[PDB]
């Protein structure tokens, strides 16, 4: 009942905070530069399309993620601090909840700037084949493939923003995370949010494909998905002394 109420300020906020929508996203998709190869790669950087001491390709790839990732999470914060349950939190709790958060809601964001080809770069400026970026040496290539092994079969669900802005608020607000001091509010607030979802995703996609549940294993392939990319970048940290790590990444991914 107050659920439709409910998601409209959770799709507001989101379109309050993100530059990237999906919407805007798909529309480009179907002109951005292409970067597929070393040469056009050094022509987007030319001011065209756009730091550390450069070391290599694969590393100043590496370091514009950094970049992107570090401002998504910027966004990420304004969002969640656009709800207001998730305001009422104590700064300790919030700063929890976008700690193991914010990776989960990344890469799902990141489906809606992905097709099998490869995904846009620089607020949709530029696009990057997924040909060139299984080209850059390990351990990178194989960081990135199954992110796109992922968004594929997740773009399969044909979401829209408004379908979106409710399940990254429920990544966000998870009661599961560890080191959380008001469990019972954030899973109260998570339930909301689900409860929101599925009313939703009826009104939204009436002949649903059984939606509801299969976005719900999707979270758990997303924190899956997040486990496996902590423990490559664990190893990045150990085997690539000379690549700097943005500190709060580094804080992030500390414990
Ligand atoms: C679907 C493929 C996603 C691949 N990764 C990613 C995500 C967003 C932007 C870029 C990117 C690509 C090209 C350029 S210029 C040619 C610039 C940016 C990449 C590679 S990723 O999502 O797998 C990914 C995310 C985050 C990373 O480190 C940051 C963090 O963990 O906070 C990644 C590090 C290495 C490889 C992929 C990363
Ligand atoms: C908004 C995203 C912030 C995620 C970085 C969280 O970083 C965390 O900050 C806590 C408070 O300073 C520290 O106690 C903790 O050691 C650190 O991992
Ligand atoms: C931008 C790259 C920052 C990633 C550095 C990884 O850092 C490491 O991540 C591990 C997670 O597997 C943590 O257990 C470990 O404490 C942390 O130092």
């Given at each position: 009942?107050?659920?439709?109420?409910?998601?409209?300020?959770?799709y507001?906020?989101?379109?309050?905070?993100?530059?990237?929508?999906?919407?805007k996203?798909?529309?480009?998709?179907?002109?951005?530069?292409?970067?597929?190869?070393?040469?056009?790669?050094?022509?987007?950087?030319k001011?065209?399309?756009?730091?550390?001491?450069?070391k290599?390709?694969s590393?100043?790839?590496?370091?514009?993620?950094?970049?992107?990732?570090?401002?998504?999470?910027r966004?990420?914060?304004?969002?969640?601090?656009?709800?207001?349950?998730?305001?009422?939190?104590?700064?300790?709790?919030?700063v929890?909840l976008?700690?193991?958060?914010?990776?989960?809601?990344?890469?799902?964001?990141?489906?809606?700037?992905?097709?099998?080809?490869?995904?846009?770069?620089?607020?949709?400026?530029?696009?990057?084949?997924?040909?060139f970026?299984?080209?850059?040496?390990?351990?990178?290539?194989?960081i990135?493939?199954?992110?796109?092994?992922f968004?594929?079969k997740?773009?399969?669900?044909?979401?829209?923003?408004?379908?979106?802005?409710?399940?990254?608020?429920?990544?966000?607000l998870?009661?599961?995370?560890?080191?959380?001091?008001?469990?019972?509010?954030?899973?109260?607030?998570?339930?909301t949010?689900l409860?929101?979802?599925?009313?939703?995703?009826?009104?939204?996609?009436?002949?649903?494909?059984?939606?509801?549940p299969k976005?719900?294993?999707?979270?758990a392939?997303?924190?899956?998905?997040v486990?496996?990319?902590?423990?490559?970048?664990?190893?990045?940290?150990?085997?690539?002394?000379?690549?700097?790590?943005?500190?709060?990444?580094?804080?992030?991914?500390?414990?």
């Amino acid at each position: 009942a107050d659920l439709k109420a409910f998601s409209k300020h959770i799709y507001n906020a989101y379109l309050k905070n993100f530059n990237m929508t999906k919407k805007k996203a798909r529309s480009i998709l179907t002109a951005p530069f292409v970067i597929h190869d070393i040469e056009t790669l050094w022509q987007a950087e030319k001011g065209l399309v756009w730091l550390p001491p450069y070391k290599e390709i694969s590393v100043h790839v590496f370091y514009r993620c950094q970049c992107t990732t570090v401002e998504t999470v910027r966004e990420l914060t304004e969002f969640a601090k656009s709800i207001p349950s998730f305001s009422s939190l104590f700064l300790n709790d919030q700063v929890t909840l976008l700690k193991y958060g914010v990776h989960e809601a990344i890469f799902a964001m990141l489906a809606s700037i992905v097709n099998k080809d490869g995904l846009l770069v620089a607020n949709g400026s530029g696009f990057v084949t997924r040909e060139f970026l299984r080209s850059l040496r390990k351990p990178f290539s194989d960081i990135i493939e199954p992110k796109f092994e992922f968004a594929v079969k997740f773009n399969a669900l044909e979401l829209d923003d408004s379908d979106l802005a409710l399940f990254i608020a429920a990544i966000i607000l998870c009661g599961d995370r560890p080191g959380l001091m008001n469990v019972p509010r954030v899973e109260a607030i998570q339930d909301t949010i689900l409860r929101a979802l599925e009313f939703h995703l009826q009104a939204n996609h009436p002949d649903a494909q059984y939606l509801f549940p299969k976005l719900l294993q999707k979270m758990a392939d997303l924190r899956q998905l997040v486990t496996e990319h902590a423990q490559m970048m664990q190893r990045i940290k150990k085997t690539e002394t000379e690549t700097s790590l943005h500190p709060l990444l580094q804080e992030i991914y500390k414990d």
